[PDB]
Amino acid sequence: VNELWFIDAQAMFQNYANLRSFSKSNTTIGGFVFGRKARKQVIHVLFAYAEDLTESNRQFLESSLSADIELVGNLNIDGQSQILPGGQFTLQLTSRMLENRSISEFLDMNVMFNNEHVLMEGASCVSRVGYEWSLRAGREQEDVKSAAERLSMASFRFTYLNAEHGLVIREQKPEAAQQKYLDKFSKGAVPYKDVIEFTAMQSLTRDHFTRLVTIGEVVFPAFFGDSSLDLYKRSREAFNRRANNTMMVTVNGIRAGRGVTTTTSATYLPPGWVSLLHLQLPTKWTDNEQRNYRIRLHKLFNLPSSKPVLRLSQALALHSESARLTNKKLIREPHLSITNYQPVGEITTVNGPYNYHHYMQDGIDDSGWGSAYRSFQTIWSWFILNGYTDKPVPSHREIQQALVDIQDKQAKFVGSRQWIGSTEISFVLNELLKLECRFIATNSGAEVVERVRELARHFETSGTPVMIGGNMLAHTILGVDFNDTTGETKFLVLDPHYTGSEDIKTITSKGWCAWKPASFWSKDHFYNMVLPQPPSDA
Amino acid sequence: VNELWFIDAQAMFQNYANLRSFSKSNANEINTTIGGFVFGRKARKQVIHVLFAYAEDLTESNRQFLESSLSADIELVGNLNIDGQSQILPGGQFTLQLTSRMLENRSISEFLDMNVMFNNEHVLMEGASCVSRVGYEWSLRAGREQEDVKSAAERLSMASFRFTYLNAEHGLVIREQKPEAAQQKYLDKFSKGAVPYKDVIEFTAMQSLTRFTRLVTIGEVVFPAFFGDSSLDLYKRSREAFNRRANNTMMVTVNGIRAGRGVTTTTSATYLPPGWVSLLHLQLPTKWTDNEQRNYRIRLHKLFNLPSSKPVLRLSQALALHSESARLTNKKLIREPHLSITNYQPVGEITTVNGPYNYHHYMQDGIDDSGWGSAYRSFQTIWSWFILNGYTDKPVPSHREIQQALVDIQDKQAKFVGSRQWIGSTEISFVLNELLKLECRFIATNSGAEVVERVRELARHFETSGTPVMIGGNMLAHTILGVDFNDTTGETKFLVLDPHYTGSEDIKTITSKGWCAWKPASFWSKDHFYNMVLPQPPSDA
Asked: Which residues does UniProt mark as catalytic (chain B)?
């Protein structure tokens, strides 16, 4: 007797705002409503202009979302928006309610719907597959559409197998369903880091032109309670969407004369989504033609147009054989773990992912002098994990030899154990990356406690990790907790000294990625702070 | 002392007799001397196959054809020498020293006197048979087909280790493992007290999804699974098994071009020939003149030391191990129901049918033959034995087809052809003689007590002819497949296949609800006369 649908209204309003941010790159506005049809839950509300409301586009959108999410309906803003044949309802919206974010007005205009802060569920099964296509020259586009067409037909005989846990996913009659299969993996799991890696297989008893070989990930979610039968149906659908997505990107370049490009698989989980974004990227297109693609995708999936989101550098790596642009041994966002600490004021931290760099990694002994360098590397991780560069995290010898190329120290400083500081860092970035930087020069350790006002402003705008040096000791700061009416301040430090080659437990334990009170910084020595400034493109 | 070998010396003598069988003119012909190869389980020192061959066939090119045809756990382990004047092809670790008197007299004792480190053993068949249907594709450059096919099969064995065999039903999986990840006693639940021809674990052969004239050869691959087998032990075999079939497919294809028929596809067949405790794995050409075929039959018989009396390697005789494997007359029909029985224990000596057969009950062939069909239905079970044992390939006749034969042979009339009339053993014997030129023998009784008294005549029949027997009396027709008889107690039991109608192919009903079980001697009415027809098989391959 469940006739009510649930929908995160705030998420919908945000997506609408993200589309409106494109007065740079007037017609009416409509959209598609994607969600989980069975449990009647809206997961994705994608707005688009009238042009972009074609079947061609909704087929690209639905092929990019998780296999359990489908088109459940559309929406009509101000009663003058174009409506495509879609799901089982039509959201009645107004530009007035959408810009004021009046949930007060939405709820009583759409009766069947109740608000709900939608949350991430289930794990993420991932496996690498590969399909080869042959294209009759002169009619390449016509073949791709019919090559992927026959592929989605042959999807059933595919068999995904996990070895160490003895798991197998394949076609099976409903009576062969194992009921709480993989429940031990998806109980309190989240799609971003809880993965179940499978090996994709096919039976041996089945089977001037251009050939196209495409290898790529395939990701389908595993929830708590679903059976072996439910997992198979998703594993199949998840495949077809990856294939169709590949065909659409391919036929796009074909129709644009950019030839048959190879593709590259990527998974994303953009800003505030509770499901993943599955995309096949044309990595053979020109470096600028790729940029025009992220622009188009931002407009399609309603994404922020300020900072980059769909860069290959910041794509999730859920498969062990997937392309790593950072080091896979490293801890990613270690400061997320601390949940015990209670805010003694206003909370504000670094906006974005980053890797923990410290002593003893890079098969070096950084005893003492290494406190300086590692914080630079931590900063560098932020710039590739947020999609600004492809360049790997440089080593000590690479840093020093970039600080000689600019004629700063002295040549013997390559491979020198000699110390560096805040200023040295800012120069290295500038050289390697055409990047700017900002400073906070103090004369006392108490002075940084007075100037927390401008430290939080950095995390608000730029939101990059900051390097602080003084009293011979260098650390990294990810966030600050300031109370303007109490005066009480405390810092989120990241002691770049040696606390394990990846053991989050011991770190959190002894003040490493620890929260720091104001009396940390000695009031007898002076301190400098580097505030890395990210560029203005996406 | 420690390296004692085991060999079924009696079975070796038969293989020599089977090769010698094709001559039937001892000391009358002028021929090359006879040598042979000894195959067996090298690990446990157990000789399984002793294959004799005239000299010409004592070549490396031929030994590879034999070894690729035997089960995966069996390899070349030695030669043999008859009267010290045979050719020896270097190989193995020993050479059996046989003599002419030994092979004629079949003196096991004389074998053991000359071959000191050998002990005679009645070798039995162990373990189950794992089967999977596997396909592969070869490309042959025109003019270099023969050159490529030898190489295309080479690198196929090199990539046969990336395979994964998976049983969906029981969640069983065999793939490449690190020796420490080996799962001990893996398929003991399936291989304990099992036999290669009946107990079958079916897998689907899978490959990683991320890895001129064309030739594609699909076909089954069978490797044995024993008790106590490690998970790695099964992997080593499953790989060697596939390699051999591929080489066999290669060898058959190559010498096909050298013999005339050129490049032909091959169908895969697996046999359990008379007397063997292991299986025979063969790849057979699908296209060739009938001269080329019958010569191929005769030679496979000579090479594998098979009799020249029984037919052995007919396609219809091939085991039905895999489900997708083609079948001759196995529609929904159950093959050998009486084998799916362990409810029974002997009350004395027991002799049963020797060969496969199909259960033909009521209403199964479209039309409903209710209470008159029983005699026809047992006739059909008999006919199935003759096609499943390579005596013919003609399909099991329908009721109308049977009745027409009686009219053709001028027994019963044209209206008989139309009808729902009753027939018996005496009409059955006539149809077998008209349609198959068969000869039948009768056990004519006047009471159901005489049936029990003359049980030795049945036990003799199954021991000598092996064909299933229909019995007709008291308005009922049945099918006798075996007999249990204690010649001191007088206690007598009958194995009866009831032609009367069961639902469908379900042994649980048939085995337990009595439609195919053992019957007491009181099963036959003492007040009515009974006749039994004993179909007699011919004597040619």
From this structure: 374, 498, 500
Q: Which amino acid is at A437?
A: C
Taking contacts as CB-CB distances below 8 angstroms, the residues of chain B near A202 are 206-207, 209
CATH of residue A364's domain is 3.90.70.130
Count CB neighbours of B97 within 10 A. 17
Q: Which of A128, A204, A215 sits opposite B207 (nearest CB)?
A: A204
Residue A203: its chain B contacts at CB < 8 A?
204-207
Closest to A119 measured CA to CA, from A272, A310, A239, A342: A272
Output helix, strand, coil percentages for chain A, rounded to the nearest 5. 30, 25, 45
Length of chain A, please? 538
C-alpha A465/C-alpha A381 separation (Å) is: 10
Query: Do the beta carbons of residue B284 and residue B294 sit within 8 Å?
Result: no
Other CB atoms within 10 Å distance of the CB of residue A429: 20
Spatial separation of the C-alpha atoms in residues B14 and B103, rounded to whole Å: 9
| DSSP per residue, A234-285 | HHHHHHHHHHHHHHHHHHHHHHTT------EEEE---TT-SS--EEEE-TTS
Using CA atoms in the order B88, B89, B90, B95, what is the torsion angle rounded to 10 degrees? -40
- The CA distance from B509 to the nearest CA of chain A, in Å, is 22
Q: What is the resolution of this structure in A?
A: 3.3
Closest CA to A425 of A453, A459, A383, A460: A383
Q: Name the β-bridge partners of B2.
A: none
Domain around B454 = 334-536
CB A448 within 8 A of CB A530: no
Measured in whole angstroms, the distance separating CA B229 from the mean position of its chain's CA atoms is 25
Nearest CA of chain B to the CA of A202: how many Å? 5
Which residues of B fall within a CB distance of 8 Å from A159? Answer: 166, 206
Q: Which helix (H) or strand (E) holds B205?
A: strand B200-208
DSSP code per residue over B64-124: HHHHTTB-TT-EEEEEEEETT-S---S-SS-EEEE-HHHHHHT-HHHHHHHSTTEEE----
Q: How many interchain CB pairs under 8 A, A with B?
A: 54
Which residues, in sequence order, are CB contacts of A535 under 8 Å at separation 6+? A388, A435
Residue B135 has its nearest CB partner, among A128, A199, A204, at A204
Tell me if B27 sits within 8 A of B100, measured CB to CB. no
| Termini Cα distance of chain A | 47
Tokens standing for B274?
């008379």
* HSE value, Cβ hemisphere, 13 Å, CA-based, for B109: 1
For residue A529, the SS3 value is strand
CA-to-CA distance for B196 and B190, rounded, in angstroms?
11
For residue B60, what are its two tokens? 């490396």
Strands (E), A405-510: 436-441, 466-470, 473-482, 489-493
Query: Chain B residue closest to A206 (CA)?
Result: B135
What technique solved it?
A: X-ray
Between strands A5-7 and A41-49, the pairing is parallel
Interface of A with B (CB under 8 A): 128-130, 158-159, 161, 163, 166, 168, 170, 172, 176, 199-206, 215
* A163–B166 C-beta distance less than 8 A: no
Strand B531-536 relative to strand A528-533, pairing: unpaired
Task: Give the integer Cα–Cα distance in Å for B146 and B262.
Answer: 9
